[PDB]
Design a binder for these strands. Sequence first.
DNA 1: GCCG
DNA 2: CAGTAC
DNA 3: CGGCAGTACTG
Length: 326
Amino acid sequence: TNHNLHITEKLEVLAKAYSVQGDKWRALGYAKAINALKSFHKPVTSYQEACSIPGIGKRMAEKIIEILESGHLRKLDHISESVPVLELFSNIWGAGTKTAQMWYQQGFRSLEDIRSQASLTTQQAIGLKHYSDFLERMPREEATEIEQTVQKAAQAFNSGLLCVACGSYRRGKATCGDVDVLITHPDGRSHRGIFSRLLDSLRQEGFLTDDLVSQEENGQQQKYLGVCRLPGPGRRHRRLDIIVVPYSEFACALLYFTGSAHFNRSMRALAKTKGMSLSEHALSTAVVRNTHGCKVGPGRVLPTPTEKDVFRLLGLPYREPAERDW
DNA sequence: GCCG
DNA sequence: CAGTAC
DNA sequence: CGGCAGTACTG
Ligand SMILES: O=c1ccn([C@H]2C[C@H](O)[C@@H](COP(=O)(O)NP(=O)(O)OP(=O)(O)O)O2)c(=O)[nH]1
Ligand SMILES: [Mg+2]
Ligand code: NA
């Protein structure tokens, strides 16, 4: 429940500008600050009141003060005019800040420019084709139907397969940007080489319409990122992500795929302070790092049969999916 | 941008 | 590898 | 000063 709309809305514009211009760390600090403000019980009113909140420092406090006194924020007036166009371009799935800036430098200004003149990767041409649809969020009811479509095709050739929708869906959101389906098998073996069968069952259905990321050649494929559409009238194309994991990694894979992203990053950061390491595969202990925080020794994987175990081993109180937006 |  | 994405 | 999460594809 945000009690600081006047501040955050202005800061969000600044954050996105830095983000789309490639200033990733400056944008990160803004994100942390902006959210911290979203959580503060009351309207911040003093410069000193700003500083007290974790994630807000001198420079951010000064901008808050400027908004409180002026009603405007000077920096917003000197945002480059490239920014709306950079944002337009990097909302193409598969194009990031580097591609957007290259396109801009080549003189492109519109998606029509991109369509007719830009060189597109196979991913980007798919992203552009679905530009509007990928910017839409679906109601969670539709996410349920998509999960069930995948689960049916998976359990059709192995009833032992376990399928759960994660991401925003498992965090209880009303709408979902995509559907994230985690698949595993409680015997630790039969999960192997099933992207092959699953993806083909979903193609023969006509359910999958485009593949973005799908390394089907080597046999150790971990993820499928693609595009699906439910049958019948009134249906939009939706983004679909599927991961298949060993049963031993279920808790960590669940935790990762449920998110939020900032939640994962906070948790991973905490583990690092404890000489541990957390990934989608495993929670590890006795991890040896150099002075730049870079792993140089692998450490021991800890047994983590459930999500609660991960929290426990990290010395943290358990948090339900709905409580993990930050 | 923030923070140790 | 750099870029992009989850 | 310098890290800011830790991974998996693409070409
Ligand atoms: O940078 C990321 C992105 C995603 N993730 C994890 C968390 C996230 O909840 C999960 C699913 O990725 P999505 O892109 O689908 N985000 P989410 O489902 O939370 O929101 P949306 O409704 O936009 O799909 O992957 C990360 O750990 N790091
Ligand atoms: Mg999602
Ligand atoms: Na993009």
